[PDB]
Amino acid sequence: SSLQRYEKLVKECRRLEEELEQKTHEASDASQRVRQLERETTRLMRRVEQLVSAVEGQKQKLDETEAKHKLELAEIENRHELEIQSKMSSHEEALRRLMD
Amino acid sequence: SSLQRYEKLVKECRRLEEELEQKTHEASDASQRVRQLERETTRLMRRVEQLVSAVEGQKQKLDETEAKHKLELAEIENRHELEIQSKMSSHEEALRRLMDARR
Ligand SMILES: C[C@@H](O)[C@H](N)C(=O)O
């Protein structure tokens, strides 16, 4: 009776002490895992941020190559039309000097 | 004394029980945060692979755009050479006919 009731409560106290020890080891294991994952997430968010800046940089660079090319084309076209006009001018002076 | 001995052990059992519940709650919060981190980890990893693929796609588009620009420049030079040759040949015909006329 009385001794048995007391030893049953002693045994429950020990069961709580051993479960507490187990949960302490598991909480320690979990904290190792959270810290490991937080080091990964922060490292991931950084490279994502660098890659977004990279994509926007390549997109800007493509608009720049197109802008330079369209200008190069316009300069070439202007220079060629003036060269053709120069030939026509020279031809007219030649005809004027030969035919008087 | 028998009663007092049991009641003192009862209070310790409450302290341990309450301490186990606090540790149970802490483990419950921790393992939930792990699961959220594992989800965010795969979500971020998926975006890294996307952005890397987007980078390689833009680099190929850039090289082909440069290649296309170089072809268009060569075709412009070709057409200009065509027109120069046509102008100079028309001026030579005009010369030949006008020198014939004044003969
Ligand atoms: C829980 C405890 O108080 C009880 N005496 C038992 O035997 O489990």
Residue numbers in the entry:
A (entry chain B): 116 to 215
B (entry chain A): 116 to 218
Excerpt from the publication:
Kinetoplastids (such as Trypanosoma brucei), a group of evolutionarily divergent eukaryotes, have a unique set of kinetochore proteins that lack any significant homology to canonical kinetochore components. KKT4 has the following predicted regions conserved among kinetoplastid species: an N-terminal α helix, a coiled-coil region and a block of basic residues in the microtubule-binding domain, and a BRCT domain at the C terminus.
Although we still failed to obtain diffraction-quality crystals from T. brucei, a crystal structure of KKT4117–218 from T. cruzi was solved at 1.9 Å resolution. If the first and eighth heptad are included, the pitch increases to 163 ± 60 Å, indicating less supercoiling in these terminal heptads. Instead, we observed elevated B factors for the region where we might expect to find an unstructured linker in the TcKKT4 structure based on the sequence alignment.
